[PDB]
Amino acid sequence: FNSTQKFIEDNIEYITIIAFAQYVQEATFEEMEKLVKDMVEYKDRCMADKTLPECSKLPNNVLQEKICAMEGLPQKHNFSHCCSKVDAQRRLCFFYNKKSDVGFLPPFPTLDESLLNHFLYEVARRNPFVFAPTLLTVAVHFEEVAKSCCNKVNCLQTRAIPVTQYLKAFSSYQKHVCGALLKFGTKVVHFIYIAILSQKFPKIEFKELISLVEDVSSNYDGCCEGDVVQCIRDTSKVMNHICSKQDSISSKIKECCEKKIPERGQCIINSNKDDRPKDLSLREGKFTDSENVCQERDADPDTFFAKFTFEYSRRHPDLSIPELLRIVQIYKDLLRNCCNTENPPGCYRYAEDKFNETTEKSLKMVQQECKHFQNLGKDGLKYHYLIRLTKIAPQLSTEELVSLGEKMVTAFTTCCTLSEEFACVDNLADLVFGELCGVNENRTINPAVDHCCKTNFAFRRPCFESLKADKTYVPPPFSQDLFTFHADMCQSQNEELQRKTDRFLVNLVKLKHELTDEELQSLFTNFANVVDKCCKAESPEVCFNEESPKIGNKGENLYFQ
C-alpha cells in the first residue's frame, strides 16, 4: 500500500493527465494543466491534515467533479449529460463518453518534464482504454528512446515504432477483456484469467490461483471503468501478491519482482510461461474416470468448472485461451446432458475425445491459413481478408475495415513461423473480432454480426468465420473519384500508399458486393496490373482513364450505384 501511495503522490501530474485526456479526448493541453493544478492542491491539502470532508471521497469522483466544475467544458465537448448525473451513474456516463474511433483527432505531433506531459496527453487521448501502468511504462521507454537521439525529430519518430507496438499489444488485450466484461459479465473474466494464469504458472496451487484470479478480476473492474488511481493500486496489489509467493508460483519472475512500480507489473505480464512441474501427469482423470463427477459438479458448479479449467489449462501450454474456454464449455454442456441420463458415467467417460476433436479441427484450420500466408505473402493475404471482412460487415467504415484487415494479417506475420503458431494465431485473431464488437458500446453493424458479437465469448471467432456475405446490405452511392488513380500513386511512397490501395479494394467490394470473392479478386488484379503498367508510362493520367476496367455501366458517371 505505502510504496503505491508514494508512487501515486509523486506521479499525480502524469496520472491526472491520463484520466482527463482519456475521459475527455477533445480537451486541450492548457485545460490538462488547469486540472493538474487543482489535483496537486487537493494532494497537498490532504497530506496536511487528512481529516477534511473532501479528503474522504474516492479519487475518481473527485477528478470527475473538478472536470465537471470547469467553466463551459461539459457543453463545449458534449458531456453535460454525465455531469447532470451523480456517483455511480456519473462514473458510468463518463466510461460511455470514451470513443475508440479517434478519427476526429489530427495526426500525432513531432516532439522536438513537459516532453513526458505532452507525450502522455497525446497518447492517452488517442488510446482512451489503455491502463495507466502500461501507459506510464510506455512513457519511460519513450524518455529513453527520445534521449538516444543526439535530425533528432525524425530520429524520434523512427525508433518509437517498437514503443508504439508495445502500447497497441497491451491495449488490444486490455480492450478485449474490458469488452468481454461489459458484454458477458465478471464470470467470463474470471474464467479467462483461470485459463491464462494456470497456463502461465502451472506449478501454482488451486487455492492460491483462485485468490490471484479474484485480485486480477477486481483490478479489471477498476481499470475498465477508467479509474486510474484505483487501477494503479489494484495492479500493485496483484503484483505484491505474486512476488510474495514467488517460489510457489513461477521461477521465471525473479528479476521482475526486484523492480519497482510500475515496471515490475509489466515485466511479470511479459514473462515467459513457467515450465511444467516434472511430476505433473499428462491428464487429470477425475473429470472423466470417476463415477461421482455429477455430484462433484452439483456440490459447487462454478468451483468445479474452475478446477477443470485449472487442471486442463496448466497441462496444455500450446492451446490458445479461446480454445481452452471452448473446451470448458464443451465439458459443461456434455455434463448438462449426461448428468440427467440413467448412466451418467457412461457418456462423460470419453469427453477427452470431444476435446481432442475440436482442438484438431482448430489446428488444421490454422495450418491451412498459415500455408495461404506462405503461398501469397502479406499483401496477398491481406486482400483476401479485406474481401471477406467487407462482405460480412459492409456497414463498417472503409477506414475501420482496412484497420481490421491489417490487424488480421499481422496475426499471421507475427505467428506463422514461430513454435506454437496455433496458440499465437488464435489468441491474436480473437482480438481482431473483439475490436469489431466494441469496448464500451454494443455496436449495431448488421443482425448476423451482432449475433456473433453478443451470444458467446469463446465461440465468437468461429461464429464470424462461418458467416456468409451480408445479404441485407444496401450500399450508399460511391463517387467515381474513390476509384480514380492520380499521378501521386506512381512513386515509392510510404505505407499510406498501401492504405490507399486497401481503401480502393474495400470500396470496390462495397460497390460490387453481389460479385463473388473470386470475381472481386479478379477485378482487383485487373486494376493492379493497369497501375503497374501505367506507372511506367509517360503521363500516367491518360493511361489510367483509357486502360482501367469499367466499374460503372454507362449513363452513370459521377456516382456509381
Ligand X SMILES: *[C@@H]1O[C@H](CO)[C@@H](O[C@@H]2O[C@H](CO)[C@@H](O)[C@H](O)[C@H]2NC(C)=O)[C@H](O)[C@H]1NC(C)=O
Ligand Y SMILES: *[C@@H]1O[C@H](CO)[C@@H](O[C@@H]2O[C@H](CO)[C@@H](O[C@@H]3O[C@H](CO)[C@@H](O)[C@H](O)[C@@H]3O)[C@H](O)[C@H]2NC(C)=O)[C@H](O)[C@H]1NC(C)=O
Contact residues for ligand X, defined by CB under 6 A? 182-185, 442
- 22 lies in the site for Cl ion, by CB under 5 A: no
Residue 340 CB-half CA count within 13 A: 4
**Selection from 171, 175, 172, 177 nearest residue 193 by Cα:** 177
C-alpha cell, 515: 460479385
Q: Which of residues 169-208 bind Cl ion (CB under 5 A)?
A: 171
39 contact partners, CB below 8 Å, separation of at least 6: 12, 16, 63, 66
Q: How many CB atoms sit inside 10 A of residue 505's CB?
A: 25
Q: Which residues on adjacent β-strands are paired with residue 365?
A: none
Cα separation, 381 vs 123, in Å, equals: 30
Please tell me whether residue 522 adopts helix, strand or coil conformation: helix
User: Could you say which of ligand X, Cl ion, ligand Y, none residue 171 binds, taking C-beta under 5 to 8 angstroms by partner kind?
Assistant: Cl ion
User: Could you say which of ligand X, Cl ion, ligand Y, none residue 185 binds, taking C-beta under 5 to 8 angstroms by partner kind?
Assistant: ligand X
Question: Which H or E run contains 273?
Answer: none
User: Could you say which of Cl ion, ligand Y, ligand X, none residue 184 binds, taking C-beta under 5 to 8 angstroms by partner kind?
Assistant: ligand X
Cα separation, 327 vs 355, in Å, equals: 6
Cα separation, 355 vs 25, in Å, equals: 45
> For residues 316 and 513, which CB has a smaller minimum distance to ligand Y in the complex?
316
User: Could you say which of ligand Y, ligand X, Cl ion, none residue 352 binds, taking C-beta under 5 to 8 angstroms by partner kind?
Assistant: ligand Y
User: Could you say which of ligand X, ligand Y, Cl ion, none residue 239 binds, taking C-beta under 5 to 8 angstroms by partner kind?
Assistant: Cl ion
> For residues 352 and 547, which CB has a smaller minimum distance to ligand Y in the complex?
352
Burial of 109 (0-12, 13-18, 19+ CB in 10 A): exposed
> For residues 135 and 439, which CB has a smaller minimum distance to ligand X in the complex?
439
Cα separation, 360 vs 352, in Å, equals: 12
365 contact partners, CB below 8 Å, separation of at least 6: none
Shortest CB 414 distance to ligand Y, Å: 24
> For residues 129 and 170, which CB has a smaller minimum distance to ligand X in the complex?
129
- 356 lies in the site for ligand Y, by CB under 6 A: yes
Please tell me whether residue 479 adopts helix, strand or coil conformation: strand
> For residues 318 and 399, which CB has a smaller minimum distance to Cl ion in the complex?
399
Judged by CB under 5 A, the residue of 59, 265, 405, 540 near Cl ion is: 265
- 318 lies in the site for ligand Y, by CB under 6 A: no
Q: How many CB atoms sit inside 10 A of residue 410's CB?
A: 17
Shortest CB 333 distance to ligand Y, Å: 18
Shortest CB 453 distance to ligand X, Å: 10
Q: Which residues on adjacent β-strands are paired with residue 559?
A: 479
Applying CB under 6 A, the span of 17-25, 223-231, 351-359, 529-537 interacting with ligand Y comes to 351-359
Q: Which residues on adjacent β-strands are paired with residue 479?
A: 559
> For residues 244 and 356, which CB has a smaller minimum distance to ligand Y in the complex?
356
Contacts of 237-243 spanning 24+ positions with Cβ under 8 A: 237/4, 238/212, 238/265, 239/264, 239/265, 239/268, 241/211, 241/212, 241/215, 242/212, 242/268, 243/268
User: Could you say which of ligand Y, ligand X, Cl ion, none residue 356 binds, taking C-beta under 5 to 8 angstroms by partner kind?
Assistant: ligand Y
Report whether 194 contacts 306 (CB < 8 A): yes
- 262 lies in the site for Cl ion, by CB under 5 A: yes
Shortest CB 348 distance to ligand Y, Å: 12
298 contact partners, CB below 8 Å, separation of at least 6: 339
> For residues 216 and 239, which CB has a smaller minimum distance to Cl ion in the complex?
239
Cα separation, 460 vs 322, in Å, equals: 9
Q: Binding-site residue total for ligand Y (CB under 6 A)?
A: 3
> For residues 324 and 432, which CB has a smaller minimum distance to ligand Y in the complex?
324
Judged by CB under 6 A, the residue of 65, 352, 541, 547 near ligand Y is: 352
- 353 lies in the site for ligand Y, by CB under 6 A: yes
- 249 lies in the site for Cl ion, by CB under 5 A: no
C-alpha cell, 138: 510506455
> For residues 185 and 285, which CB has a smaller minimum distance to ligand Y in the complex?
285
User: Could you say which of ligand X, Cl ion, ligand Y, none residue 353 binds, taking C-beta under 5 to 8 angstroms by partner kind?
Assistant: ligand Y
Applying CB under 6 A, the span of 267-275, 350-358, 384-392, 507-515 interacting with ligand Y comes to 350-358
User: Could you say which of ligand Y, Cl ion, ligand X, none residue 442 binds, taking C-beta under 5 to 8 angstroms by partner kind?
Assistant: ligand X
> For residues 442 and 545, which CB has a smaller minimum distance to ligand X in the complex?
442
Q: How many CB atoms sit inside 10 A of residue 265's CB?
A: 25
Applying CB under 5 A, the span of 67-75, 119-127, 248-256, 309-317 interacting with Cl ion comes to 119-127
- 129 lies in the site for Cl ion, by CB under 5 A: yes
Which residues contact ligand Y by CB under 6 A?
A: 352-353, 356
* Residues that bind Cl ion in the complex, under the rule CB under 5 A: 127, 129-130, 171, 239, 261-262, 264-265
